[PDB]
Paper text:
In all the structures presented a peptide could be observed at the “clathrin box”, lying between blades 1 and 2 of the NTD β‐propeller fold (“clathrin box”). For the cellular peptides (AP2CBMpep, AmphCBMpep and Amph4T1pep) the binding is similar to that previously described, with the 3 leucine side chains of the CBM LΦxΦ[DE] consensus sequence occupying the hydrophobic pocket formed at the groove between the 2 blades. In addition to binding at the clathrin box, we observed significant binding of the cellular peptides (AP2CBMpep, AmphCBMpep and Amph4T1pep) at the “arrestin box”, which lies between blades 4 and 5 of the NTD β‐propeller fold (“arrestin box”). While all 3 CBM peptides bind in the same general orientation at the arrestin box, the molecular details of these interactions differ from the interaction seen between NTD and the extended surface loop of the arrestin 2 long isoform (arrestin2L). Most notably, the directionality of the peptide chain is reversed. The first 2 leucine residues of each CBM (LΦxΦ[DE]) bind in a hydrophobic cavity lined by the side chains of NTD residues W164, L183, S185, R188, V190, I194, F216, I231 and V233 plus the peptide backbones of Y184 and S191. In the structures presented here the side chain oxygen atom of NTD residue Q192 forms hydrogen bonds with the backbone amide protons of these 2 leucine residues (LΦxΦ[DE]) and the side chain nitrogen atom of Q192 forms a hydrogen bond with the carbonyl oxygen of the second leucine (LΦxΦ[DE]). In the AmphCBMpep structure the side chain of the phenylalanine residue that follows the CBM forms an additional hydrophobic interaction with NTD, binding in a hydrophobic cleft formed by side chains of residues H229, I231 and A247, the aryl side chain region of K245, and the peptide backbones of residues 245‐247. However, unlike at the arrestin box, residues that form the molecular interactions at the Royle box do not correspond to those conserved in the LΦxΦ[DE] consensus CBM sequence and we note that several peptides containing a CBM sequence (AP2CBMpep, AmphCBMpep and AmphCBMlongpep) do not bind at the Royle box.
Author numbering:
A (entry chain A): 4 to 363
B (entry chain E): 1 to 7
C (entry chain G): 1 to 10
The structure:
């Protein structure tokens, strides 16, 4: 028995996608609802839109854009060409917004159902789709990210804690540089890290939820995962005890590094995926490592939360669309019998109302 | 300028 | 000032 379930959803090459376009600059997956791929047939650039609830019928439309990102929940698409940004409601066949920047945008994404984040060489902006909103500057970039490839931007639920992540080669290894910004304090902190996420977590005995920041890193001296509360705890709350635990890289994977993290608030577990296709599962409360294995031979370059299972969905270099989630009927007996950790098994059973700790 | 052709 | 104390010495 395994504590996780693997599932193949699609092979993109079977939907007519050219394998040269399956990669970070041309394929976007902003949620589990859609995948968008930019392709060029002759001199005509186009976008292919795959509805994940009807994937055998993809739509190809002509474009003149260098990047395209679909809204997480709706057929509303953002396109850009250098400094020109445009937003379309596809079913309405209408241009809902247009804005001209004064810098090129090196990375962008949807950070909520209604707000786009825009990263330039110098700063980070938020752009709300509500009313007549224009972009607002959130913070200036820190010099520690100068010259990095920007690979992600994330926030907490309330958009008060903001995190930008870049990577580069230093001393023949892939080095991660993050910038954590506090909206209320107006202060940045540089942190060495590769992949991260925020989470809401309600501790035993507390009336309010805690806001947690979890980040993984491969440093000079090996891999580490950190779980720490950000900000002042709500009035009356016990503070969350911070944890730091090892992240294992085998001796044969000298160049591998963390590329993605999703946290399940249903199960309170952390899913961590590496560049070269290794999955790790950790308990969010204690930081205990539950499981590790290689699940892809091809590299993984994009992920999102998988809503149906509360897991993680991803796309590899070949075009396999794959997901991993907690196997609810096996996780408790696995932790008891394979990990031989009855303490964790009992906790996770009662905490998330799972079966299998009746016998320990 | 129009970045997507819907017609 | 720093945002997070990332020395995990108790």
């Amino acid at each position: 028995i395994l504590p996780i379930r693997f599932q193949e959803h699609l092979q993109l090459q079977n939907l007519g996608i050219n394998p040269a376009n399956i990669g970070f600059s041309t394929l976007t997956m902003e949620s589990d609802k859609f995948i968008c791929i930019r392709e060029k047939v002759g001199e005509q650039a186009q976008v292919v839109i795959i509805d994940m609830n009807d994937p055998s019928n993809p739509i190809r439309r002509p474009i003149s854009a260098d990047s395209a990102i679909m809204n997480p929940a709706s057929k509303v698409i953002a396109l850009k060409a250098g400094k020109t940004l445009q937003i379309f409601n596809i079913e309405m066949k209408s241009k809902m917004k247009a804005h001209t920047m004064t810098d090129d945008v090196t990375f962008w994404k949807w950070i909520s159902l209604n707000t786009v984040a825009l990263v330039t060489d110098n700063a980070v902006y938020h752009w709300s789709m509500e009313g007549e909103s224009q972009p607002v500057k959130m913070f200036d970039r820190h010099s520690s990210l100068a010259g990095c490839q920007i690979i992600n931007y994330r926030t907490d639920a309330k958009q008060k804690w903001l995190l930008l992540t870049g990577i580069s080669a230093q001393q023949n290894r892939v080095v991660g540089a993050m910038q954590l910004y506090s909206v209320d304090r107006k202060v940045s902190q540089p942190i060495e890290g590769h992949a991260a996420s925020f989470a809401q977590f309600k501790m035993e005995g507390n009336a309010e939820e805690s806001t947690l920041f979890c980040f993984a890193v491969r440093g000079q001296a090996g891999g580490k995962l950190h779980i720490i509360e950000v900000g002042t705890p709500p009035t009356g709350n016990q503070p969350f005890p911070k944890k730091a635990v090892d992240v294992f890289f085998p001796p044969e994977a000298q160049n591998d590094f963390p590329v993605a993290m999703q946290i399940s608030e249903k199960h309170d577990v952390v899913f961590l995926i590496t560049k070269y296709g290794y999955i790790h599962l950790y308990d969010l409360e204690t930081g205990t490592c539950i499981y590790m294995n290689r699940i892809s031979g091809e590299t993984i370059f994009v992920t999102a939360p998988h809503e149906a299972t509360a897991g993680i969905i991803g796309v590899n270099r070949k075009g396999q669309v794959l997901s991993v989630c907690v196997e609810e009927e096996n996780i408790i007996p696995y932790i008891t019998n394979v990990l031989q950790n009855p303490d964790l098994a009992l906790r996770m059973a009662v905490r998330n109302n799972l079966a299998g700790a009746e016998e320990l | 300028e129009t970045l997507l052709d819907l017609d």
